[PDB]
Enzyme design. Structure first.
Site, PDB file in Angstrom:
ATOM      1  N   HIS A  78       8.711  -4.691  -5.999  1.00 22.55           N
ATOM      2  CA  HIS A  78       8.592  -4.016  -7.293  1.00 22.55           C
ATOM      3  C   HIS A  78       8.865  -2.525  -7.081  1.00 22.55           C
ATOM      4  O   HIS A  78       9.357  -2.137  -6.020  1.00 22.55           O
ATOM      5  CB  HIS A  78       7.180  -4.254  -7.891  1.00 22.55           C
ATOM      6  CG  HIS A  78       6.052  -3.718  -7.052  1.00 22.55           C
ATOM      7  ND1 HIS A  78       4.730  -3.892  -7.391  1.00 22.55           N
ATOM      8  CD2 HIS A  78       6.055  -3.004  -5.898  1.00 22.55           C
ATOM      9  CE1 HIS A  78       3.961  -3.308  -6.484  1.00 22.55           C
ATOM     10  NE2 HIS A  78       4.740  -2.761  -5.570  1.00 22.55           N
ATOM     11  N   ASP A 121       7.408  -6.547 -11.442  1.00 19.78           N
ATOM     12  CA  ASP A 121       6.950  -7.378 -10.328  1.00 19.78           C
ATOM     13  C   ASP A 121       7.843  -8.607 -10.172  1.00 19.78           C
ATOM     14  O   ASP A 121       7.979  -9.413 -11.089  1.00 19.78           O
ATOM     15  CB  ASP A 121       5.507  -7.824 -10.552  1.00 19.78           C
ATOM     16  CG  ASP A 121       4.509  -6.704 -10.315  1.00 19.78           C
ATOM     17  OD1 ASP A 121       4.922  -5.530 -10.206  1.00 19.78           O
ATOM     18  OD2 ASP A 121       3.302  -7.002 -10.240  1.00 19.78           O
ATOM     19  N   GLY A 178       0.821  -1.194   0.000  1.00 27.11           N
ATOM     20  CA  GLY A 178       0.000   0.000   0.000  1.00 27.11           C
ATOM     21  C   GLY A 178       0.861   1.251   0.000  1.00 27.11           C
ATOM     22  O   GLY A 178       1.978   1.244  -0.510  1.00 27.11           O
TER      23      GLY A 178
END
Lengths: 6, 174, 174, 174, 174, 174, 174, 174, 6, 6, 6, 6, 6, 6
Positions: free
Chosen positions: E105, E154, E51
């Site tokens: 990432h 990623d 987040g």
């Protein structure tokens, strides 16, 4: 709200 | 709770639009207080824009049924059925704050469908208006034909006009 | 709750837009505190963008009706009916924090339908405007026509300007 | 709650966008703690993207009014009015965690309508900009001219730069 | 509550995306536990998709500030800022269940407006990336440019690969 | 609560789609129960359509980690990850009601963007499928090639079929 | 709350549209009060626009099954299934307030699909009407033909009209 | 709560559409009452339109597993799986109120995607229909050929018809 | 906010 | 966050 | 999750 | 609503 | 669901 | 709903 309601 | 403390002093607050839930709540409170003491006076404070006619009549009928006299006080605004209820308070015990506003008019409604269905709804709403105007005429002392002409369109009145009209008995000040 | 803790010190918090719910709640607190001690002053903290005129008047009439003198404090912003209530605080006991803002303007509304209905709505809002302005005039020392001219458009004032105008009595500096 | 526990230790949590709800909550807490003990310092932890200028000034004004010196700690991010409140902490008592971020810029707003209306909104937002920049120059020790040029566009700073700029006094570590 | 039961055992649960609210909560739990006893270790269980970077850094910084050593456990998935916090646990006390996943990432964000504004946003996200990557470098033993190359897209790792990379210290068999 | 009483008897209820929140809750209960009595067996009742693979693995890894043996009971339907957990119960303690269903298939997912990004997502889901299939093979006793072709499409089995496949050990009757 | 008080006095409030939820709630209350005291009569207050036929019939069958006699009171409005229930009150114990209304009409429904599917639906609703009409005829004393013709369309009646029709037995005046 | 009061009397309420949540709740109550006393009978009141086949079977399988004989009572409506459960009540202990309705038909489902995926779904729902029809034939005494025929389309039955069919054993009149 | 409201 | 806020 | 977190 | 319901 | 889970 | 469920 008194006098008179109460 | 603040309102629970007010109910302790036998004060009921009608502070929103009138729908079945609000009506059922006020009806219960009126019966409860009447049970606590059938002699003790009850005060109904009103700041509402009105609402459902049947819900309003349910409160009206409860007020007429119980022994306790129910005084009414218009705080802010008592419009439509809210005004009807205000004017329905015990004669001589109907109050309004200095800057309160009262508004009376005719019932609002709808009718959709076939001609015959629209006729059913029409006949019904016209009967309600007659029933409501006759009571207002009794409560205010105004002849029925005056109530009929005066409710044709939204009729807003000041606390002073409402007193003059017969909707309230006295204006509170200080 | 923290607010219930402030209520015990006779502080009522008006920190949101004014609608019938907020009005009904504040009116209740005012009556409650007036019953707790009709001698002790009450402090109304105001930080709101204003709101409903009738809801605002319900608060105004209750402040005037009760025995306790109601002090008003402008925190952050007191706009429209919020400013009206700020200016309605006991004379000499109307305050504002150093960087608070006070804004006054005219009533806002709407009308839809027949010329007759639009007229009814127009007459009402202009009447509400005069009603509010006359009070503001009395409260500030400005004549009605000046209040009228100055509220034609949104009129934002600093704490200093609000004092100079007569909306508040003192600024809580340092 | 976990915050009720922090309040006991005189720690106020400003961990969200600043609106009237939050501002009023913070104001109450500030008054509460100052009441509980006007001597002990109060800690205001800040992790906020900022928000309403008036809501922010309400917190600012309260921090200035109370006797207790208010320390401020930037955790995560202190942007816009959050950064303003951070810099408003008791001189020498302004902190920031090592990877905290602080951002300053100019007020944001809107204006829609007639030219006269736009002008009113423009004059107000410009006055606010000056008011905020003036305080920021006092709190950071930075000349007004620098504050004006440096807040022209979003200006992000690390804990290190915020210290060099005079927005905080110390960077927490161990 | 089960989480309250675990907090008593000094176990903090980070089981959701990371935003300011989650961050402020975890920060509070850390300060709380650290108050209860600055000697006893604290366990941060992580099953999160990550987040906000600033919210995550607030957690990282608090973990670093308190005296108690903070062990971390990857349960299910620890991605992005969730993976960052996993790698931030006390050296030697970073764990992962046998089938847990860990993904790293680059920062994600956006920007719309004038060239100048896009540039401000670009410089900032690239700085945040450097800041996060330098910490991962220190934490894993990988040089900065390897961290950068490896987070370009990623990068999903098994518990075994996470260990080999230096993101964790041990895998919990049973 | 009806579930608190069940927990008191060491019964954990997985009766919804599996997501992080559900997983975290189940993991917490497993740790709690294992702490209360690391010798007494635990029962995981399952009526789930499945859900996240990482959340499901979080549950799987906790079941294997704790000392108590976790028995599983299929109620109504255990599909996908739910069927995976059902099959993960202590050998000899995997049950199903006479009419319950068990369904197995392959991981579901998505990927949008550049070829390279689609490649990464593809490699991951294929890896997850291989990992889950290897465990299913180990738990049922079936060869991996069998699990592979049998999970190609939605594979619905009756309690008897589930037993004969090795997903469960016994069928509850009376 | 207020209704809990009412329930203690053996008063059940049917004050909303009738759906299975409401129906199950009223059935529970009837069964409870009947268990509490099978001799004391129960009072069902009604202010409802009606609702589902099967839900209304659940209430109806419970009223008849239990030992206590159930009085019905129409407040505001008793329409459709609400009127049905009002009329099902113990004979001689069916009441209405002076200004309440009672409305009866025919079942409402829908049907979509193949001819035979529409036919299935048509037959059911026609059977429903016959069943309700036969009970109304039995409850009011009116011939079936009269009920059938009178329920063709929305049929609004005053308390007085409802009494003279046989839907209630007495009007609660004061 | 009122339902909690009925649970103590070993009465379980299935008054809504049957889904996983409702099923797991009902299954819980059944296991609970069985624990309380495995000898004392249990009552399942049913007013439901039906729902998930798997959710229903979970309820069904739990009714069969526990020692306490479970009686069923149709109030208002028992359609689809609700009717299935009604018929599954202890032979001789399946009831229905005078005006309750019972409906039986065939499973409802959906199929989307490739021909092969539609085949999977089709095969599953047909197996379910046969599984349910087989039990319905056993519970009612009706030959399978008749159940298959009678469930082709929505088949609504009155309490009397439910009785003659074998779905229930007695009608609760007085 | 005292002196003087309270 | 003490020493020194508290 | 002990040995050793707790 | 008594006399007579209750 | 006992015998034997519990 | 007794006699006989309960």
């Amino acid at each position: 709200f008194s006098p008179a309601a109460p | 709770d603040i309102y629970s403390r007010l109910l302790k002093d036998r004060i009921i607050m009608l502070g929103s639009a009138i729908d079945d839930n609000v009506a059922n709540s006020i009806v219960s409170q009126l019966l409860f207080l009447a049970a606590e003491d059938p002699e003790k006076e009850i005060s109904l404070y009103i700041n509402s824009p009105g609402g459902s006619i049947t819900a309003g009549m349910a409160i009206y009928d409860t007020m007429q049924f119980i022994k306790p006299k129910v005084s009414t006080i218009c705080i802010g605004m008592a419009a439509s059925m809210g005004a009807f209820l205000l004017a329905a308070g015990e004669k001589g015990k109907r109050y309004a704050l200095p800057n309160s506003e009262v508004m009376i008019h005719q019932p609002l409604g709808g009718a959709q469908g076939q001609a015959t269905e629209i006729e059913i709804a029409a006949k019904r709403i016209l009967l309600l208006r007659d029933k409501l105007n006759k009571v207002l005429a009794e409560r205010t002392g105004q002849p029925l034909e005056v109530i009929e002409r005066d409710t044709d369109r939204d009729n807003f009145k000041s606390a002073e006009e409402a007193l003059e009209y017969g909707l309230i008995d006295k204006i509170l000040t200080h």
